[PDB]
Structure 1
Amino acid sequence: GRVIRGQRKGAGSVFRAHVKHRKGAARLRAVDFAERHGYIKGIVKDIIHDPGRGAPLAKVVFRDPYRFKKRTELFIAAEGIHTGQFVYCGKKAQLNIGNVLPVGTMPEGTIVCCLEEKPGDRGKLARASGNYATVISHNPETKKTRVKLPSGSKKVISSANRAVVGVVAGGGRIDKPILKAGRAYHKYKAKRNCWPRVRGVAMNPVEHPFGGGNHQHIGKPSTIRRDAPAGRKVGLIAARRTGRLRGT
């Protein structure tokens, strides 16, 4: 009879993201004439640590093509780039680590770092540390490019979508065991209020579907249908299978 945790997360009050010390939205530069027809050169002025994410951010300074001013971007650092390096963005850019160029101009096996989901927004795919997408195929007619995402899925996107060449830095961050509830606490303190996770079976029936009972048991199938009402769909949501994943 009480609103459950997870239902309370949508109101956001205590569950908003901790964005106080974050360095800004990490984005490619907006597409313009230089991107669309040639290339523009920028210099990697810094590489910084953004709180809450494991990927380093690259502070890159470009020249404004229309007025006397310096434009600073916050690219996601592809691994291997360094400060004092020139990075080139546009259609006529060459294949080098850190360059930004449309996928349609890239060969049939290249892999990319900050891919655009739509032709013109900034980078949206393969942004988390150590991740990359792969350019599988092209067709010049219909101007489509098929790519492979970090989840293993295949997606058809416009050939005009830009991406950074290389893998995003931050390496195999998930290899190291956390080893400590304190380290987990410090990890999630920079992200959001989610970490100390109470099992639903350890709750009372009023605040969870799984709560209650003299023994800590679920008491009902933990797989729950997709169209279950909020406050009920807890557990394995619309699971196609359960078990051990033997074979794939």
Structure 2
Amino acid sequence: AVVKCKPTSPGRRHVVKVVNPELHKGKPFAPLLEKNSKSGGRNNNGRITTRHIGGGHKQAYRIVDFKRNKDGIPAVVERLEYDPNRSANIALVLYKDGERRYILAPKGLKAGDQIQSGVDAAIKPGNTLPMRNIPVGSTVHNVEMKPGKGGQLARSAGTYVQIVARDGAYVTLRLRSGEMRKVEADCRATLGEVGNAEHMLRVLGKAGAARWRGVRPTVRGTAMNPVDHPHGGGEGRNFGKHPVTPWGVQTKGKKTRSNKRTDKFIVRRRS
């Protein structure tokens, strides 16, 4: 649901919490947890490559099965857990032979529903099967790119890809950006949109809300001296320069897509 907090204190006034009481309030499933040390946006050289990242609360990586290669084995969803690594929810699904795994939670999924993988599965939210078996025009998610790589597209909350058309081995996909990209037909895909579609409407309210989220303070360009940023300088809010990045690269209108090897799959660019 959408909880709108009461302004009993400034900074709590605008906060909008999103509760999902179907979530498992207990502890996570131990056999699928591994350490996830934070980086701080620093590479091997130690230099901070990406800024505004670091600090925040400690979390643990939950191994989510994106591959979904359990062909011919039914599975029943036990419960819905909270995965801090995503923007969506994950479900601890149990197989008939006793194997437990974590899969991305689709929209219409409850604690106790039946799913399965392979080209046998009926078109029902949760089931995975190659796109050469999936009806043209249906709504899917967690789409693979290389037949067996794992699943790349549509992985955020309430995000889905719509299988537009099929030309032999190629499948036209209207992505979330409004960009149509062709993909090999032997790629696995999962039916149904990703759940927790209300993750977007959540507001943070507090400045420190983003601080434990992981984000650090971002300083604007016109608040620094010229040696630090191309905008900088000034004796009182002067700009007179064309909007750039901290490295002279033009921003606010400048396509920097330099691929050329993947242009062969793009039908329509983002519009």
Partner of 1:97: 125
Q: Please state whether the residue corresponding to 1:184 is helix, strand or coil.
A: helix
Q: Deviations over 1:139-180 (max 9, x none)?
A: 2x3x11111111111011111111111110111322244333
Unaligned runs of 5+ in 2: 1-40, 257-270
More helix by share: 1
Partner of 1:126: 154
Shift of 1:85: 1.8
Distance in 2, matches of 1:234 and 1:201, equals: 16
Shift of 1:52: 4.0
The normalised TM-score by structure 1 is: 0.74
Shift of 1:11: 7.4
Distance in 1, matches of 2:255 and 2:147, equals: 33
Shift of 1:76: 0.7
Partner of 2:199: 173
Q: Structure 1 152/11 Cα, relative in aligned 2: closer, same or farther at 3 Å? A: closer
AA aligned to 2:240 is G
Is it true that 1:59 corresponds to 2:75 in the alignment? no
Distance in 2, matches of 1:41 and 1:17, equals: 41
Supply the RMSD in Å over aligned alpha carbons: 3.0
Shift of 1:222: 0.9
Partner of 2:225: 204
Q: Structure 1 11/201 Cα, relative in aligned 2: closer, same or farther at 3 Å? A: closer
The 8 Å contact of residues 104 and 144 in structure 1, kept in 2 or not, is answered as no
Identity of aligned residues (%): 28
Match among 15, 18, 21 for residue 59 of structure 2: 21
Is it true that 1:159 corresponds to 2:168 in the alignment? no
AA aligned to 2:221 is G
Shift of 1:20: 4.6
Q: Structure 1 6/72 Cα, relative in aligned 2: closer, same or farther at 3 Å? A: closer
Unaligned runs of 5+ in 1: 65-69, 225-229, 241-247
Q: Please state whether the residue corresponding to 2:204 is helix, strand or coil.
A: coil
Match among 223, 232, 235 for residue 248 of structure 2: 232
Partner of 2:139: 111
Distance in 2, matches of 1:101 and 1:30, equals: 9
Shift of 1:86: 1.7
AA aligned to 1:206 is V
The normalised TM-score by structure 2 is: 0.68
Q: Please state whether the residue corresponding to 1:178 is helix, strand or coil.
A: coil
Partner of 1:227: none
Distance in 1, matches of 2:254 and 2:128, equals: 39
Shift of 1:21: 1.9
The 8 Å contact of residues 28 and 73 in structure 1, kept in 2 or not, is answered as no
Partner of 2:77: 44
Distance in 1, matches of 2:113 and 2:192, equals: 15
